[PDB]
Scaffold this motif. Structure first.
Motif, PDB file in Angstrom:
ATOM      1  N   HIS A 150      -1.379   4.935  -0.755  1.00  0.00           N
ATOM      2  CA  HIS A 150      -1.070   4.028  -1.346  1.00  0.00           C
ATOM      3  C   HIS A 150      -0.987   4.272  -2.908  1.00  0.00           C
ATOM      4  O   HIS A 150       0.094   3.815  -3.605  1.00  0.00           O
ATOM      5  N   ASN A 175      -5.352  -5.892  -3.970  1.00  0.00           N
ATOM      6  CA  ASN A 175      -4.369  -5.112  -2.742  1.00  0.00           C
ATOM      7  C   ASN A 175      -5.410  -5.783  -1.589  1.00  0.00           C
ATOM      8  O   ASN A 175      -4.882  -5.526  -0.420  1.00  0.00           O
ATOM      9  N   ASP A 206      -0.702  -4.785   1.293  1.00  0.00           N
ATOM     10  CA  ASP A 206       0.390  -4.096   0.846  1.00  0.00           C
ATOM     11  C   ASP A 206       0.120  -2.510   1.138  1.00  0.00           C
ATOM     12  O   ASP A 206      -1.032  -1.881   1.012  1.00  0.00           O
TER      13      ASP A 206
END
Ligand SMILES: c1ccc(-c2[nH]nc3ccnc(-c4ccoc4)c23)cc1
Length: 255
Positions: free
Chosen positions: A131, A138, A150
Motif C-alpha cells: 500500500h 484507510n 483501498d
C-alpha cells in the motif's frame, strides 16, 4: 430523495458519506432495502494513466474479495467512459474519526483491531501489493471489525505521520507497510503518533530519518504490545519485523 441505477438495479440515495474532487460516496438503499455504499467516480477529466490506476485497483479489489473478509465487499459495479459506480459494503465509521472521538481504548478492542489490520495488509502483500500510504483513514469499522478500504493503487490529507524512513529517503517493500501499521498501533497505545509533537513538517521528516532521534516507548502493563511497537518502528527496513512474523507474535497469539 434521489435515486440511481447500477447494473439495472435501482438504489435510493440516503446521504453523501464522502466527497472527492472527482468522486463521491453515497449511502444508499436497494430494492430489498439493504444498505450499501456507492462510490461514484467522474471520468471526464481523467487521463489514461489515471484510468488504468482506477481499473487496476478495481480488479485487485474484486479479486481479493475471496481471500479475506477484512477487505471491504465490492458487490457490483458499472463502468463507462464517463463514470464508475461501485456498489460496496457500507461501514459505520473510518478508524481515524473513531480514534479522534474516543478518549481511551480498550486493550481487547485494540488487539482485535490490530489483528484485523494485519490480516488485510497480509492479504494484499500475498498478491504483490504494498500500500505504502497506510493511515487510520484507510480502515473502516463494520460489525466491530476493521476492513481495509483501498489498496493505494488508484490516483489520490497527505499526512507524513505514518510515513516510513525509506519513503522519505526515496522521496519501499512490504516492510514500509509495517512501519505505518506500527504508527497506527502506537497511536492506539499512547494517544499520539511517534512524531506528532513535531509541528514543523521539515523538522518532523528529519526526525523520522534520524537514528539519533529516539522514539519514546513509555512502560505499559502490556509488555508484548511495547515490543511490537519497537519491532515495527525500527528505522532500518531490514531490522524491522515482517507481517508474517507479526502474525506469530505473542501479542496477537497469547490470551
Ligand atoms: C464512514 C462510513 C462509511 C464509509 C464507507 N463504507 N464503504 C465505503 C466504500 C468506499 N468509500 C467509503 C468512504 C470513504 C470516505 O467516505 C466513505 C466507504 C467510510 C467512512
Amino acid at each position: 430523495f434521489q435515486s440511481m441505477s447500477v447494473k439495472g438495479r435501482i438504489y435510493s440515495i440516503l446521504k453523501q458519506i464522502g466527497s472527492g474532487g472527482s468522486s463521491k460516496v453515497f449511502q444508499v438503499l436497494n430494492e430489498k432495502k439493504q444498505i450499501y455504499a456507492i462510490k461514484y467516480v467522474n471520468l471526464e477529466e481523467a487521463d489514461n494513466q489515471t484510468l488504468d490506476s482506477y481499473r487496476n485497483e478495481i480488479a485487485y479489489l474484486n479479486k481479493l474479495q475471496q481471500h479475506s473478509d477484512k477487505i471491504i465487499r465490492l458487490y457490483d459495479y458499472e463502468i463507462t467512459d464517463q463514470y464508475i459506480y461501485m456498489v460496496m459494503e457500507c461501514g459505520n465509521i473510518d478508524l481515524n474519526s473513531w480514534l479522534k472521538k474516543k478518549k481511551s481504548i480498550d486493550p481487547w478492542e485494540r488487539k482485535s483491531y490490530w489483528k484485523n489490520m494485519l490480516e488485510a495488509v497480509h492479504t494484499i502483500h500475498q498478491h504483490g501489493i504494498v500500500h505504502s500510504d497506510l493511515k487510520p483513514a484507510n480502515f473502516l469499522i463494520v460489525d466491530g471489525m476493521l476492513k481495509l478500504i483501498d489498496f493505494g493503487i488508484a490516483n489520490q490529507v497527505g499526512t507524513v505521520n505514518y510515513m516510513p524512513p525509506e519513503a522519505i529517503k526515496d522521496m519501499i517493500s512490504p516492510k514500509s507497510d509495517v512501519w505505518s501499521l506500527g504508527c497506527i498501533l502506537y497511536y492506539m497505545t499512547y494517544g499520539k503518533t511517534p512524531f506528532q509533537q513535531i509541528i514543523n513538517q521539515i523538522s518532523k521528516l528529519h526526525a523520522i530519518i534520524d537514528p539519533n532521534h529516539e522514539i519514546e516507548f513509555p512502560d505499559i502493563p502490556e509488555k508484548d504490545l511495547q515490543d511490537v511497537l519497537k519491532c515495527c518502528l525500527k528505522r532500518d527496513p531490514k531490522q524491522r519485523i515482517s507481517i508474517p512474523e507479526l502474525l506469530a507474535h505473542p501479542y496477537v497469539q497469547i490470551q
